[PDB]
Amino acid sequence: KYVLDPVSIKSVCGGEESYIRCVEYGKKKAHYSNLNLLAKAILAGMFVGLCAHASGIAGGLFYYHKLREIVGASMSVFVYGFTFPIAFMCIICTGSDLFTGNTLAVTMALYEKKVKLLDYLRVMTISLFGNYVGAVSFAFFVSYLSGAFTNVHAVEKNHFFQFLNDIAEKKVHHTFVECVSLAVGCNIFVCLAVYFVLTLKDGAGYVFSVFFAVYAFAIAGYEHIIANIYTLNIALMVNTKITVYQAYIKNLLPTLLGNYIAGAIVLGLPLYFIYKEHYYNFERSKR
Amino acid sequence: KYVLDPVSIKSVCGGEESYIRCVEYGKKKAHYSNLNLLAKAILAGMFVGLCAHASGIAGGLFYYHKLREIVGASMSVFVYGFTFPIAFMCIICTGSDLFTGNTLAVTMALYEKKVKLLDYLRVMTISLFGNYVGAVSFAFFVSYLSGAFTNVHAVEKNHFFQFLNDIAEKKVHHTFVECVSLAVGCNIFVCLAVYFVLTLKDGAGYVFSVFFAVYAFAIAGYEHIIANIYTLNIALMVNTKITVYQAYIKNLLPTLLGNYIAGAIVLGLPLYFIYKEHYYNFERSKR
Amino acid sequence: KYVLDPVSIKSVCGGEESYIRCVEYGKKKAHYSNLNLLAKAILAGMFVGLCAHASGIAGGLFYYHKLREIVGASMSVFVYGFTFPIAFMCIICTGSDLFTGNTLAVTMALYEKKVKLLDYLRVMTISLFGNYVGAVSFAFFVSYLSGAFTNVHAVEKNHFFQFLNDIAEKKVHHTFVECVSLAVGCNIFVCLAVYFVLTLKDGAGYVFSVFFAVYAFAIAGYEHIIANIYTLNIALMVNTKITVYQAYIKNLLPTLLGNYIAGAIVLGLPLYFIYKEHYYNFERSKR
Amino acid sequence: KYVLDPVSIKSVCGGEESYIRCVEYGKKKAHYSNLNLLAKAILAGMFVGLCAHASGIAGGLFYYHKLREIVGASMSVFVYGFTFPIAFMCIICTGSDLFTGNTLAVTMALYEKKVKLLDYLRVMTISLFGNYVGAVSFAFFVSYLSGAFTNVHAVEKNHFFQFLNDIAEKKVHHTFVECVSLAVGCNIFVCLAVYFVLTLKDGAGYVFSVFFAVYAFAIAGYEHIIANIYTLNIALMVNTKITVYQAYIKNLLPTLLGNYIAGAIVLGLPLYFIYKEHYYNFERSKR
Amino acid sequence: KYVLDPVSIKSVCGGEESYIRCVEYGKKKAHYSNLNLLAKAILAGMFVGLCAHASGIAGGLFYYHKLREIVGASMSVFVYGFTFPIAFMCIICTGSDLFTGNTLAVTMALYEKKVKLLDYLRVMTISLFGNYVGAVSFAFFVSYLSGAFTNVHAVEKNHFFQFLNDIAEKKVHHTFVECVSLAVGCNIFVCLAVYFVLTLKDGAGYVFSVFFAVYAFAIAGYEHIIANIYTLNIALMVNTKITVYQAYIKNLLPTLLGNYIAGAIVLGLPLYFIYKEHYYNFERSKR
């Protein structure tokens, strides 16, 4: 028995089905309990801190002072962006929730009258607080207590502290509008990575679409709020040149504002206007 | 219970089914409303601008003045072509429409008498105008307002402005025939990437065929009209050496002409001549 | 409802089914009309010329005269072999026919008495002529008219012409037996890539098996007849050091002979001897 | 017959199904016999030693003394982390058991009252002892007896011994708390790789999620107990600078403690609290 | 009609099903005729010689004498290990048999009383003889007759002969025990690659698991018998420094012994002890 023509399959979907999957995905976050959503948010912040520690070590390896004289910071940022995107896979495969992914899906479910307003504010507040707690807890209990980014004062050995110092100094010197624009550019990639998870339902579609999307903002200098919550706090712990006013007012608040703008307004509102009749049809065809 | 021989499946199709899928894909664009097609075109131009900003930063990192003395512009163009092809995935997974993808599919549906002539002109005009608006809006609101490509006048720090300046000077110095030929070579790759999306219906077939096809024209110096609409306008915004006559007459019009020629004539007309009887059989077997 | 054990599937086949698929694939080429087969051959030659232009630009970028002093021609040939293999995906996904792929499949169908002798000669002649016409048409209308490989006489800028000149001089200096042996080594990889397309019926199996198989012959210095038809003609157009006698007698005829030998004799005849009883059963089980 | 819309499939699962699959996976380890579990543990330790020997040779190639002066140890650690993650695939595809993977799954089955306490201690003890025996047996019978890491005393040839010496000296100079923190960071990645195997049920989902997860801790300097059992014992065999007290007390005991903490407490207990009602529903729907 | 939850599939199997598939795979080799098995073995040796010629050229490109002064032999061995693993795909997709793959599967079928003893000796002898004939035939008719590894005596051009000379001198200087240990380490990877083909039944699972497994022994300096049969014979043909006693007694003999030991004893006997009751149940459930 020989098979000449096998069964034709497909592991992808259209734009209408991707919109309906995203609205149904954001609708489920409002039905968890408070402690369940809080534990998932703390786990997601911990995963972000884990892979950002790994990326900082991998980028400070290529920030060696003799290699830095020839290539600058190019290979450091490339190996950082290569090492980082597994955090999103760790978040998705355990079912954890990130705030920047929720800014598209839960807001889309708010637009479609699937989530109430107080439930929306409750979900977003609990998700942001849990992501902060998880990222700062990983920055203290693993990153600070292992001594990986300690200032060791010798230029042939200090290339991990110096990479953390220069990265934390670069992202704390923007003006308000520049940090808001870079955060908008970040969260468009992050929400599109969530959309890729909802669309391409196989292993390579999970791994490599999210890999290219997260590498693309990690190498562009775009500003993610949870990765900055990890990075600026570990940079404050190991005593880099930044201060706490520079960390929280000059980076974290414009990053939060731009990340919310890119998910709720730039991406969610045109896609709602495009596919709201398809969501209306899907729902009517359930009676 | 042990499975010795599983069920034989297949996530690919033949050339006849790919042609029928492309004609049916281009036939659907003439049935959207004007505002729906306009919003999808604006979103596609925004995605092109997003990943071209990311690619310009990733290429200007490797354009550091000490690395540039050894390797020239080789690693800059390679990392640009590595970072760019996720834009096409962002366009496909949200259901947005690009003009260069439409030049094959909607013209094929025009040849098969599925789209009328005024509907064809309406769809192409709305798609080109929306792609222009989205790309220039991203070039101003994110790329210009973040200060990423500002001339900072110091050779150890000016490697983002200098990469943008040299790229925008290289693609503005062609003659008419050279720019038309490079645009033809670009849009053959872009229309083949659309054909790859219609053929390989899984996650790796979406990601990596489009990756190799878009990297191949990004490293070849081929001319894409929407990427040039982004790049020459951000190069005019940050005050590179090019002028607006050089940007619009010496690059953009021959790129539009060559991109339309490669989709409507070079690729669409032989494929129509090859597979029009298979499309006739597909239609005849629906009565 | 939770899925603990999903449905076991398989997107691969055995050697007997791959042989039967290859004989049935080569049997279909003798049933097209002459103009249909001619148009598919012209499209395949055009795709080969397209991705060879892209690979020549990508390899001449890394052939910069300061990088060439350190690494030689290693990174140029690696980036050429990285950029090239998407040509075969273009050929496969549109349904075009290449001569070197046909030398295995149509000859296997000739051995199994599925194609007559005059139909075999007609199919091979039309395929070779159309591939030549498509490759020389792309070499003139895109590669020559864009000025990408023009001798610009300055050593810091002439690294595209110099890469084309040195590649075209390297592959024109072989003796007859050396060029025949390198062509045999090429067409074994090309016919195995066709066999990979017939065996692995998913997107990653299409992309990456063909990628590794075509990169392996592009970095080995093996001789492909259609890629040489493009390369030696564009090298004659931009006035490199080779002549037309060296291009056509010293390279193209031994490449044609070795490419036919590797498909019809080295690969097709042992596989026919191995799997002809399976093809006999497959045919006997259709009555 | 043309297929326009194929059958929609999916090779991924949700978080609840991944939890149920992990509890059912850890429940099966307590039902093997003692010799079966011991043989699987010895095979897993042998695979870890195999791919760590391969990674040590691949990293000592890039630790050449003229390349080490420019890039430091960056390319050595990158090629180590590139070469290493196939060990886990070798462990999964043969059905072998690793201790660090078991610390999540068997502890989750202990929390759900599926494994008794003495069965838990028996499974963990037999798994750790077999992994130790397999790793030290590969370190002697292949790594030591082949002479690959012999001190050859000449700086142009000693780059395998020097890479092993510097890696074994770096991971033996930590304090207790630093080694515990790095081991926690390691076993979060290892348990998430086990979770990726249970979630993404296709070939790319097996290969590349595990690749990125294991590369991410191999480049971060995180501490795996079985890889350290191989590495410190082969470093003691070829007479590096470390001692047996430094190997066993200063590295191996804090690595065991942190690896158990990250699987049983950091990852297993929140996921149990999140998904224990879904496991209760899965069991209630089997009567 | 929108698909919200598609059909859950799986392209992987467990360890018991992989063992049963391996025993049934090795049991089929004893049922071929002598000429069929001989032709498949000759084809497998030819494929090994093909991709080893390609890997030798790709590694001698990066062995350029100015690059060799900085990085040593690191990039040469990396590009060799990158280029090599497509040989295994060429062997699998045509249905050819390699001796090193057979040492696990046919010995497992011997342990399960599925193959008799004389049939076992006949299959192993015919497979080894055909692999030798195919590898030496490719080493003469393609590798030697093309002049690719000729000593050209100029240090700026002799980097293919010098890479072949130094590789053939490195692998001929081991002691008996060192070559046996390196051959054991090789054939564990080769038999695990065969196991990966039997387990992961999709295109990425075929390509990339075999890629990483074969790259891992190609960069580790592990000794494969068929690749050494090619390499030492082409090194004797182009007159390197080795002799025929060094080639056949000091390398080939211990490589054959270690490759048989790693398949029949190290890997086959524990896996037989683990899964023989599952094979008994699989057979008992066929009556």
Author numbering:
A (entry chain D), B (entry chain C), C (entry chain B), D (entry chain E), E (entry chain A): 7 to 293
The authors write:
The P. falciparum lactate transporter PfFNT, encoded by pf3D7_0316600, belongs to the formate–nitrite transporter (FNT) family. After glucose is broken down into lactic acid by glycolysis inside the parasite, the end products, including lactate and protons, are extruded to the extraparasite milieu by PfFNT. The 5 protomers of PfFNT resemble as a pentagon-like homopentamer, with a width of approximately 80 Å and height of approximately 70 Å, with a 5-fold axis that is perpendicular to the membrane plane. Similar to the reported prokaryotic homologs, each protomer of PfFNT, comprising 6 transmembrane (TM) segments, presents a typical 3+3 invert repeat that is conserved throughout FNT family members.
Using C5 symmetry, we solved the structure of PfFNT to a final resolution of 2.3 Å. Owing to the high resolution, the polypeptide chain, including residues 7 to 293, of each protomer was unambiguously assigned to the density map. Although 250 mM sodium lactate was incubated with PfFNT before grid preparation, no extra density for lactate was found, which might be attributed to the low affinity between lactate and PfFNT. The apo PfFNT tightly seals at this site with a pore radius of approximately 1 Å, whereas the inhibitor-bound structure opens to the cytoplasmic side. The central pore between 2 constriction sites is encompassed by hydrophobic residues except for 2 polar residues, Thr106 and His230, which are highly conserved in both prokaryotic and Plasmodium homologous. The extra CTH protrudes into the cytoplasm of the parasite and is stabilized by 3 hydrogen bonds (Tyr8-His284, Glu30-Tyr285, and Lys120-Glu289).
